[PDB]
Design a protein around this motif. Structure first.
Motif, PDB file in Angstrom:
ATOM      1  N   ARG A 145       0.903  -1.363   0.114  1.00  0.00           N
ATOM      2  CA  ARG A 145       0.163   0.097  -0.044  1.00  0.00           C
ATOM      3  C   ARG A 145       0.876   1.206   0.036  1.00  0.00           C
ATOM      4  N   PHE A 146       0.263   2.322   0.178  1.00  0.00           N
ATOM      5  CA  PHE A 146       1.018   3.874   0.106  1.00  0.00           C
ATOM      6  C   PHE A 146       0.355   4.747   0.781  1.00  0.00           C
ATOM      7  N   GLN A 147       0.961   5.923   0.918  1.00  0.00           N
ATOM      8  CA  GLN A 147      -0.048   7.101   1.317  1.00  0.00           C
ATOM      9  C   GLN A 147       0.990   8.336   0.817  1.00  0.00           C
ATOM     10  N   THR A 148       0.319   9.585   0.436  1.00  0.00           N
ATOM     11  CA  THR A 148       1.112  10.583  -0.051  1.00  0.00           C
ATOM     12  C   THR A 148       1.715  11.453   0.941  1.00  0.00           C
ATOM     13  N   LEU A 149       2.882  12.587   0.667  1.00  0.00           N
ATOM     14  CA  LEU A 149       3.461  13.226   1.713  1.00  0.00           C
ATOM     15  C   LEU A 149       3.027  14.602   1.627  1.00  0.00           C
TER      16      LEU A 149
END
Lengths: 49, 49
Positions: free
Chosen positions: B41-45
């Motif tokens: 998975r991921f997430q933005t910064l």
């Protein structure tokens, strides 16, 4: 009778004005046949024939 | 996937308040990198102060 970075072929290598994208390797044609290549040691766009 | 996680980009003017227009956006590959490891998975910064 040329081999470029493992790509083998026999043709007439010429200068060419078609412009690759940087990451690309082989130019091609409608027939999927190899058309243009990029000289690895100095980047230049060579036709084939 | 195939060991190459490739990034694409574009920059476009938009006069609409928020959402997207009807135009086509072509994205060139930026860099084709040897990544290998998959991401679950991921997430933005963000940049705050």
């Amino acid at each position: 009778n040329f081999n470029f970075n493992g790509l083998t072929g026999t043709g007439v290598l010429t200068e060419s004005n078609k412009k690759f994208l940087p990451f690309q390797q082989f130019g091609r044609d409608i027939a999927d046949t190899t058309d243009a290549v990029r000289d690895p040691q100095t980047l230049e766009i060579l036709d084939i024939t | 996937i195939d060991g190459y996680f490739k990034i694409y980009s574009k920059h476009t003017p938009i006069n609409l308040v928020r959402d997207l227009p009807q135009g086509f956006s072509a994205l060139e590959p930026l860099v084709d990198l040897p990544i290998g490891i998959n991401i679950t998975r991921f997430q933005t910064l963000l940049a705050l102060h």
